[PDB]
Scaffold this active site. Structure first.
Site, PDB file in Angstrom:
ATOM      1  N   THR A  48      33.714  28.936  34.470  1.00 51.42           N
ATOM      2  CA  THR A  48      33.288  27.969  33.471  1.00 51.42           C
ATOM      3  C   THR A  48      31.784  28.046  33.209  1.00 51.42           C
ATOM      4  O   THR A  48      31.029  28.746  33.886  1.00 51.42           O
ATOM      5  CB  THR A  48      33.657  26.548  33.894  1.00 51.42           C
ATOM      6  OG1 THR A  48      33.314  26.352  35.271  1.00 51.42           O
ATOM      7  CG2 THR A  48      35.136  26.303  33.697  1.00 51.42           C
ATOM      8  N   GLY A  49      31.365  27.301  32.193  1.00 52.49           N
ATOM      9  CA  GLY A  49      29.970  27.111  31.861  1.00 52.49           C
ATOM     10  C   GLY A  49      29.804  25.796  31.130  1.00 52.49           C
ATOM     11  O   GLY A  49      30.568  25.504  30.207  1.00 52.49           O
TER      12      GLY A  49
ATOM     13  N   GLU B 285      18.282  29.166  36.787  1.00 54.66           N
ATOM     14  CA  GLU B 285      18.597  27.757  36.933  1.00 54.66           C
ATOM     15  C   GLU B 285      17.323  27.004  37.309  1.00 54.66           C
ATOM     16  O   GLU B 285      16.533  27.494  38.124  1.00 54.66           O
ATOM     17  CB  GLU B 285      19.679  27.545  37.993  1.00 54.66           C
ATOM     18  CG  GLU B 285      20.925  28.399  37.794  1.00 54.66           C
ATOM     19  CD  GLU B 285      21.885  27.800  36.783  1.00 54.66           C
ATOM     20  OE1 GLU B 285      21.570  26.728  36.224  1.00 54.66           O
ATOM     21  OE2 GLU B 285      22.954  28.404  36.544  1.00 54.66           O
TER      22      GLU B 285
ATOM     23  N   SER C 291      26.883  28.498  33.014  1.00 54.60           N
ATOM     24  CA  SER C 291      27.318  29.072  34.283  1.00 54.60           C
ATOM     25  C   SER C 291      28.208  30.298  34.124  1.00 54.60           C
ATOM     26  O   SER C 291      28.537  30.924  35.136  1.00 54.60           O
ATOM     27  CB  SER C 291      28.041  28.012  35.116  1.00 54.60           C
ATOM     28  OG  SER C 291      27.142  26.989  35.511  1.00 54.60           O
TER      29      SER C 291
END
Ligand SMILES: CO/N=C(\C(=O)N[C@@H]1C(=O)N2C(C(=O)O)=C(CSc3nc(=O)c(=O)[nH]n3C)CS[C@H]12)c1csc(N)n1
Length: 265
Positions: A209-210, A140, A42
């Site tokens: 974040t990811g 995604e 992400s």
């Protein structure tokens, strides 16, 4: 001793850790594995939102985009409620950054390169920042499922930290557009236990974040200290040798962030 502490984190968490801190007039370059490839996950939603901001005027953030529930193929907490309301581009920029809405980024890619040229256009925008290493090839939900060692949907700590240094501290985004991008990730509700958890309270943190398969957990961030000296921190890791369902360790990024805070006193 930075290398001896970072390898101990890898030995204790069973993962590969990669960090990069751009040098300043005061600080040096804090780098651990910073030129190896990790999955975007992400983290690409932050430079994708800036891609929508650069290519469009502020009046474009209020364009109504009509999607369906069948367009929800990824973890998308904010787009789940506005199935019939649609959502303005400014609201999907808010979802893709603050909540990491998967459907937000997908139609964010559509507004940038069309139905089938979104990932190539997001990669091209990173080239316009000087980033010739990062690449986005999938949308995604597939950009978080690439096998280990695969170069697709990957960046490096060096690459993404340089990009964010131009997004937050540089002059790639104009003032007013930079102000909303800096506000979006500073309102993020996904990275409390990552880089924030590693820096003290009176240090200001802004992050994106990811998290993905094979134990992937990333957090790209710009940190501010009480005197005001800005630093960009990129903590990316993964636990490849555990399968696709390997559990990510959010305490890993916090620990790495505590080590970079110790050399930024
Ligand atoms: C097909 O997509 N698969 C995903 C995925 O959607 N990845 C995205 C990504 O990087 N995301 C982020 C984030 O913002 O970092 C996260 C992690 S943040 C988080 N938010 C919460 O509200 C919560 O209760 N717990 N956590 C940990 C959610 S998935 C999305 C995934 C996530 S873990 C896993 N095994 N797969």
């Amino acid at each position: 001793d930075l290398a001896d502490r970072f390898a101990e984190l890898e030995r204790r968490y069973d993962a590969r850790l990669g960090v990069y801190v751009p040098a300043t007039g005061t600080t040096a370059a804090i780098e651990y594995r910073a030129d190896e490839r990790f999955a975007f996950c992400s983290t690409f939603k932050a430079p994708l939102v800036a891609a929508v901001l650069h290519q469009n005027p502020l009046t474009h953030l209020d364009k109504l985009i009509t999607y369906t529930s069948d367009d929800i193929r990824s973890i998308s907490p904010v787009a789940q409620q506005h199935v019939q309301t649609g959502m303005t581009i400014g609201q999907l920029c808010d979802a893709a950054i603050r909540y990491s809405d998967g459907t937000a980024a997908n139609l964010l890619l559509a507004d940038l390169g069309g139905p089938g040229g979104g990932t190539a256009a997001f990669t091209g925008y990173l080239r316009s920042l000087g980033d010739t290493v990062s690449r986005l090839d999938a949308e995604e939900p597939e950009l978080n499922r690439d096998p280990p060692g695969d170069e697709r949907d990957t960046t490096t700590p060096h690459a993404i930290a340089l990009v964010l240094q131009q997004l937050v501290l540089g002059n790639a985004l104009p003032p007013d557009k930079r102000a909303l991008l800096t506000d979006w990730m500073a309102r993020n509700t996904t990275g409390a236990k990552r880089i924030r958890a590693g820096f003290p309270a009176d240090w200001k943190v802004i992050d994106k974040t990811g998290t993905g398969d094979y134990g992937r957990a990333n957090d790209i961030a710009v940190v501010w200290s009480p005197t005001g000296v800005p630093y960009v921190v990129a903590v990316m890791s993964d636990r490849a040798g555990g399968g696709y369902d390997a559990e990510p360790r959010e305490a890993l990024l916090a620990e790495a962030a505590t080590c970079v805070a110790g050399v930024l006193a």
